[PDB]
Scaffold this active site. Structure first.
Site, PDB file in Angstrom:
ATOM      1  CG  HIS A  68       6.077   8.740  -2.146  1.00  0.00           C
ATOM      2  ND1 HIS A  68       5.145   8.939  -1.189  1.00  0.00           N
ATOM      3  CD2 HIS A  68       5.888   7.498  -2.635  1.00  0.00           C
ATOM      4  CE1 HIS A  68       4.389   7.873  -1.105  1.00  0.00           C
ATOM      5  NE2 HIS A  68       4.827   6.967  -1.947  1.00  0.00           N
ATOM      6  CG  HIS A  72      10.125   4.825  -2.016  1.00  0.00           C
ATOM      7  ND1 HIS A  72       9.691   3.783  -1.241  1.00  0.00           N
ATOM      8  CD2 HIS A  72       9.433   4.742  -3.173  1.00  0.00           C
ATOM      9  CE1 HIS A  72       8.734   3.122  -1.873  1.00  0.00           C
ATOM     10  NE2 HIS A  72       8.554   3.695  -3.059  1.00  0.00           N
ATOM     11  CG  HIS A 106       8.409   2.565  -7.878  1.00  0.00           C
ATOM     12  ND1 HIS A 106       9.633   2.732  -7.284  1.00  0.00           N
ATOM     13  CD2 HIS A 106       7.473   2.648  -6.910  1.00  0.00           C
ATOM     14  CE1 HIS A 106       9.430   2.922  -5.987  1.00  0.00           C
ATOM     15  NE2 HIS A 106       8.119   2.888  -5.741  1.00  0.00           N
ATOM     16  CG  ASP A 107       6.801   6.048  -5.967  1.00  0.00           C
ATOM     17  OD1 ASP A 107       5.683   6.356  -6.341  1.00  0.00           O
ATOM     18  OD2 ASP A 107       6.991   5.298  -4.977  1.00  0.00           O
ATOM     19  CD  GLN A 269       1.932   1.701  10.256  1.00  0.00           C
ATOM     20  OE1 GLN A 269       2.842   0.969   9.874  1.00  0.00           O
ATOM     21  NE2 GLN A 269       1.125   2.338   9.412  1.00  0.00           N
TER      22      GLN A 269
HETATM   23  N1  LIG Z   1      -1.026   3.587   6.818  1.00  0.00           N
HETATM   24  C1  LIG Z   1       0.070   3.119   6.048  1.00  0.00           C
HETATM   25  C2  LIG Z   1      -0.020   3.187   4.563  1.00  0.00           C
HETATM   26  N2  LIG Z   1       0.950   2.816   3.760  1.00  0.00           N
HETATM   27  C3  LIG Z   1       2.097   2.357   4.404  1.00  0.00           C
HETATM   28  C4  LIG Z   1       3.170   1.924   3.621  1.00  0.00           C
HETATM   29  C5  LIG Z   1       4.287   1.449   4.261  1.00  0.00           C
HETATM   30 CL1  LIG Z   1       5.655   0.830   3.381  1.00  0.00          CL
HETATM   31  C6  LIG Z   1       4.378   1.416   5.692  1.00  0.00           C
HETATM   32  C7  LIG Z   1       3.346   1.797   6.475  1.00  0.00           C
HETATM   33  C8  LIG Z   1       2.184   2.294   5.845  1.00  0.00           C
HETATM   34  N3  LIG Z   1       1.173   2.673   6.670  1.00  0.00           N
HETATM   35 MG   LIG Z   2       3.939   5.131  -5.988  1.00  0.00          MG
HETATM   36 ZN   LIG Z   3       6.815   3.603  -4.093  1.00  0.00          ZN
END
Ligand SMILES: Nc1cnc2cc(Cl)ccc2n1
Ligand SMILES: [Mg+2]
Ligand SMILES: [Zn+2]
Length: 313
Positions: A68, A72, A106-107, A269
């Site tokens: 973050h 990003h 945004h972050d 994932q």
């Molecule tokens: N468990 C997660 C949660 N948020 C995610 C965001 C991105 Cl961009 C990629 C993988 C992710 N895997």
């Molecule tokens: Mg965010």
């Molecule tokens: Zn973000």
């Protein structure tokens, strides 16, 4: 005014593709961003003295966290640029101006913890904003930086154009709250399927811009397999940090966040590509056909995680 940014040939070409990686050279990202503004928007949109000062104050207010971060910020702005360049005529000058700034901001001031962790910690920002906690903070910091002497990159707009753009940025930034993504996508789904989606309905546009924001925000899953796979460590390093801080509060964290259950990541994932990424990029492709490449890339990467599980890496 006659001062374009130019990128080396390879970046000049690759930056126009959805799957562009911005590289490991911190010091080129501000030029990448401006470059994208100048081609998305015009060399006119912003006074260069003021854009540069805004960009550098925003860089300053991102922290040194694994995921973050400033990288990003710029990555998400690039994806919005790709979307805006493959959909030239569907967006107003204000919307191009607003959304690139929205994605960069945004972050702002993220510390690497979820809205949840703020609520279980009883962090002050959870008192001040009950829902979309970090995102209301991020919008707040954007306004703060917009108000620094020398930093108002919008000053040349009208009172009313100004109010429209800050309202584009606020909705844009709140929409990155993934808790809100699910219903935003279900509604765009119904509206496209019944045939009631209408881009002259402002509240329809809002929903569509919201989904573009979710798309850009997740765009790490739309990269070539080696970018996607090495970013996933950064994203998991924050998750595990949070799992630790959960454990410190005497709460067992979800397995996603538990660093003792790394084994379950590839299946994790799968869930995520299935529950979130694939649906996000499907609906977005349906609404904006030229964004298909993000769906194709997301699918390739789902396939790559399936192989990780099947022991083939
Ligand atoms: N468990 C997660 C949660 N948020 C995610 C965001 C991105 Cl961009 C990629 C993988 C992710 N895997
Ligand atoms: Mg965010
Ligand atoms: Zn973000």
């Amino acid at each position: 005014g006659l001062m374009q940014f130019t990128l080396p040939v390879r970046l000049c070409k690759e930056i126009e593709l959805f799957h562009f990686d911005i590289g490991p050279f911190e010091n080129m990202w501000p030029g990448i961003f401006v470059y994208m503004v100048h081609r998305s928007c015009g060399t006119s949109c912003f006074e260069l003295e003021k854009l540069c000062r805004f960009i550098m104050s925003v860089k300053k207010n991102y922290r040194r966290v694994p995921y973050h971060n400033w990288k990003h910020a710029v990555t998400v702005a690039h994806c919005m640029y790709a979307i805006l360049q493959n959909n030239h005529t569907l967006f107003t000058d204000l919307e191009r101006k607003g959304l690139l700034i929205a994605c960069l901001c945004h972050d702002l001031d993220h510390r690497g913890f979820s809205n949840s962790y703020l609520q279980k910690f009883d962090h002050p920002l959870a008192a001040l904003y009950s829902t979309s906690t970090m995102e209301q903070h991020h919008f707040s910091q954007t306004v703060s930086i917009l108000q620094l002497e020398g930093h108002n990159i919008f000053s040349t707009l009208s009172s009313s154009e100004y109010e429209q753009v800050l309202e584009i940025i606020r909705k844009a930034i709140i929409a990155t709250d993934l808790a809100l993504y699910f219903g935003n996508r279900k509604q765009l789904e119904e509206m496209y399927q019944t045939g009631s989606l209408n881009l002259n309905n402002q509240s329809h546009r809002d929903r569509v811009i919201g989904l573009m924001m979710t798309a850009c925000d997740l765009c790490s899953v739309t990269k070539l397999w080696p970018v996607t796979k090495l970013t996933a460590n950064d994203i998991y390093a924050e998750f595990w940090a949070e799992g630790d801080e959960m454990k410190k509060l005497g709460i067992q964290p979800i397995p996603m966040m538990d660093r003792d259950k790394k084994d379950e990541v590839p299946q994790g994932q799968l869930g995520f590509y299935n529950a979130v990424a694939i649906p996000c990029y499907t609906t977005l492709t349906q609404i904006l056909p030229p964004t298909e490449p993000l769906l194709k890339a997301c699918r390739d990467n789902l396939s790559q995680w399936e192989k990780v599980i099947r022991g083939e890496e």
